[PDB]
Amino acid sequence: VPAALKRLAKYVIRGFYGIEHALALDILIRNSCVKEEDMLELLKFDRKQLRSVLNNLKGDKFIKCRMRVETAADGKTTRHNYYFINYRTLVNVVKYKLDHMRRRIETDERDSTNRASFKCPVCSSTFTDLEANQLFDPMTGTFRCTFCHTEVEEDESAMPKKDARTLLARFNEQIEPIYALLRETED
Amino acid sequence: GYKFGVLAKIVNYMKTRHQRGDTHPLTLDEILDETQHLDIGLKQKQWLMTEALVNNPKIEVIDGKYAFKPKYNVRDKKALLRLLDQHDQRGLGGILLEDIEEALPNSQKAVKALGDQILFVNRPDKKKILFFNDKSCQFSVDEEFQKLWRSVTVDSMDEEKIEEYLKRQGI
Amino acid sequence: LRRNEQNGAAAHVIAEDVKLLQFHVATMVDNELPGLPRAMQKSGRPLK
Amino acid sequence: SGLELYAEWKKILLSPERVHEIFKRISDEECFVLGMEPR
Lengths: 187, 171, 48, 39
Ligand SMILES: [Zn+2]
Description:
The structure is cut from a larger assembly and holds one copy of chain A (about 190 residues), one copy of chain B (about 170 residues) and two copies of chain C.
Chain A: H1 3-16, H2 19-30, E1 34-35, H3 36-43, H4 47-60, E2 63-68, E3 80-85, H5 87-114, E4 118-120, E5 125-127, H6 129-135, H7 155-175, H8 178-186
Helix pairs in contact in A: 1-8
Chain B: H1 5-20, H2 28-35, H3 42-55, E1 59-62, E2 65-68, H4 77-90, H5 97-103, H6 107-114, E3 118-121, E4 129-132, H7 143-151, H8 159-168
Antiparallel strand pairs in B: 1-2, 3-4
Chain C: H1 2-7, H2 11-29
Bound molecules: zinc ion.
Function (chain A): Recruits TFIIH to the initiation complex and stimulates the RNA polymerase II C-terminal domain kinase and DNA-dependent ATPase activities of TFIIH. Both TFIIH and TFIIE are required for promoter clearance by RNA polymerase.
Family (chain A): Belongs to the TFIIE alpha subunit family.
Protein name (chain A): General transcription factor IIE subunit 1
């Protein structure tokens, strides 16, 4: 268990994940194998909230879960749960959150362009340059929706796009340092 | 029943003494005289002394005379901070704010003096649990970033599809 | 469900919400499901 | 059990999205074997 893997896990979990979950990952770090009931006792949190967090953790398979059955002295049926962190699974899952973060941003901008520029207040809906020019009549001499009978301005569309472009640059700067840590891991 | 509520009354009297502020430990017989426990049998008192007084964590024994432990409860905000740090190091967990309040006067002012170093979490019973902050590592998370995080779900992603995505992206 | 996922609501909340969504969709497709409750119209008359 | 699926080998709930992704991974040629026209 080289210290580099532990450092990667600690840095990623502490910087780009939730504090309440990091609390449980701390127990996972402390001990490789822990009872689920012992994890509860260490966590000191309500069963319902813990089970919600555990369902999220099960979905993301951050920590692998196994089921063990043994016979108690009393003889009553007992169900025992074991959760333990797996580095190989964790590395891919984390990298995966990271990677799809970018696909989202690319889709957002693909959508910004997808939106139509023409928009008409009386109509209250977006209009394709196609529909606008067809609605236009050569005899009248001005383009204008046939239906609403008011001029169309495209300036309103420009504003939100500019705002999003600024956000993307900030995201790149904030996500810039974790990549070096990832590189140290691949080392 | 017999010989249980009397012990409870003694322990409550000890809390009343501590709201009084008399740090000096007191004799059990004198406590009985103050609490009108003379009527009770002596043997029950002896059993209490031998077993229950030692079992009670709040109670302490000094020079053959029994009284609370002035060390157990918090007395100064700096010691509260140090205790929180030690608890974080050893994985003890946070301490109940009601107990800290009855322990320390003006505990709320103590927390205000802590400020950022101390993290308080609400509880359905209104009890406040306190956790020391980590000085070594400090990180900032922005709400938009947390949202961009939140949408994406690996649970949708199937494990084989995971290793496949890495292999596809040529690394 | 969209708002719950947006807020990162409890996993059990989302699970029960998805269960109810599945129930509603399956009931709309067919209201005569085997061994499942019938969706009334707030008046005791099963929906068609 | 009613309108929900359980996969037991231990035993876990099978959400619709898992089956959706598995079916997407399935190839067109396998559809002919399964007697379902892919197009
Ligand atoms: Zn118009």
